Amino acid sequence: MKLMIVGNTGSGKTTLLQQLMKTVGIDVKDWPILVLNVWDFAGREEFYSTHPHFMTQRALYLAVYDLSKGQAEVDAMKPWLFNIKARASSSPVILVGTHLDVSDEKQRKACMSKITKELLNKRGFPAIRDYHFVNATEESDALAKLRKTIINESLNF
Amino acid sequence: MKLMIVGNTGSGKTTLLQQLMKTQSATVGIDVKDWPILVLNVWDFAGREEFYSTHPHFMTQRALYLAVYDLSKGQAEVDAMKPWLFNIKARASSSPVILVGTHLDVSDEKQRKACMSKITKELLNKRGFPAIRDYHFVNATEESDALAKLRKTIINESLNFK
Ligand SMILES: Nc1nc2c(ncn2[C@@H]2O[C@H](COP(=O)(O)OP(=O)(O)O)[C@@H](O)[C@H]2O)c(=O)[nH]1
Ligand SMILES: Nc1nc2c(ncn2[C@@H]2O[C@H](COP(=O)(O)OP(=O)(O)O)[C@@H](O)[C@H]2O)c(=O)[nH]1
Ligand SMILES: [Mg+2]
Ligand SMILES: [Mg+2]
């Protein structure tokens, strides 16, 4: 299923691949011939960063959902939270509802009540550190706050 | 730090990242970007099947490797492969590996004998390196018989690996 292209930088890995199929640290492509999931690594540092330890222990999560689709999308977050918990116990999560610009207040408050009650303080869900509602298509106050929360969480982990 | 962006397709994950950073599928399944602020290694998952695909079981136990070196730099590059091979071994003792020397077009005939000799006697059938299935020498920039043989080896081993 996966084809990993490894070796040192400048050896021709990306060039070889586009020729077979006929810098970014890690490039992930599908190759239909049987479909192979191809992982193109720039060098040793990038391969090392995929060790299961970093992948499962050293990660912080943005769980993103479309608020304009209403509280069922918040429900759609539960399977994600169980999966995230199973990858790591200690994985902190920030929930982000997008499409705020095309959401009603009934939806925003319902989703928040849902979040507050059903997701916010539960074992074994991950620790959900904050939640945000944003128009993801533009710069805004709320998006800048989300940006700061992501920084604060990365530093304090 | 890794930042893993998850959720279902079309929820705005890639749009949200682009906005945050301003400071077959229609979309890439997994996109991996560095974000300098502290550098965040950001992994943007299109959806559930893509996140699933990164389970450590699939990452470490369901992977075939193309181990690439520059043959115009000579037998020292074949030596450079040994650390890679120990590393691949540590992920799964069973990982199949195909070795490929590029830059054939700017290498000597002797360069290459030395590499093949080196590969043959130091890497080929060795407890515990991984399972080195084949080796090839190619100009990676063009179609060739040699590249077509490599393409075939990849199909063959992949199918055998399944
Ligand atoms: N002449 C020649 N140049 C090559 C060959 N393979 C790669 N290159 C050149 O090597 C350089 C590095 O290639 P790249 O594909 O970026 O290497 P990567 O870091 O391993 O992904 C590029 O300028 C390629 O065009 C080859 O077989 N022959
Ligand atoms: N109106 C609006 N559209 C959004 C928002 N976030 C994402 N979109 C749109 O949703 C569609 C899918 O976004 P994309 O980033 O591809 O979602 P992904 O599949 O989760 O990566 C695009 O047409 C975006 O412009 C938002 O907050 N408001
Ligand atoms: Mg490359
Ligand atoms: Mg996307």
What can you see in these coordinates?
It is classed as transferase. The structure is a homodimer. With 157 residues, chain A is of the alpha/beta class. Chain A is 41% helix and 26% strand. The first copy, chain A, contains 7 helices and 6 strands, in the order βαββααβααβαβα. The first copy, chain A, has helices at residues 13-20, 44-48, 52-57, 71-75, 77-87, 105-119, 141-155, and strands at residues 2-6, 26-32, 35-41, 59-66, 92-98, 127-133. The longest helix of chain A has 15 residues, at 105-119. Chain A is elongated and about 55 Å long. Chains A and B meet through strand 1, helix 1, strand 2, strand 3 and helix 2 of A and strand 1, helix 1, strand 2, strand 3 and helix 3 of B. Strand 1 (2-6) of chain A pairs parallel with strand 4 (63-70) of chain B, so a sheet runs across the interface. The structure holds guanosine-5'-diphosphate (GDP) (2 copies) and magnesium ion (2 copies). One guanosine-5'-diphosphate sits between chains A (9-15, 23, 42) and B (102-103, 105-106, 139-141).
Write the layout of secondary structure elements.
The structure is a homodimer.
Chain A: E1 2-6, H1 13-20, E2 26-32, E3 35-41, H2 44-48, H3 52-57, E4 59-66, H4 71-75, H5 77-87, E5 92-98, H6 105-119, E6 127-133, H7 141-155
Parallel strand pairs in A: 1-3, 4-5, 5-6
Antiparallel strand pairs in A: 2-3
PDB class: transferase
Keywords: lrrk2, ROC, GTPase, GTPase activation, Membrane, Parkinson disease, Serine/threonine-protein kinase
Assembly: dimeric
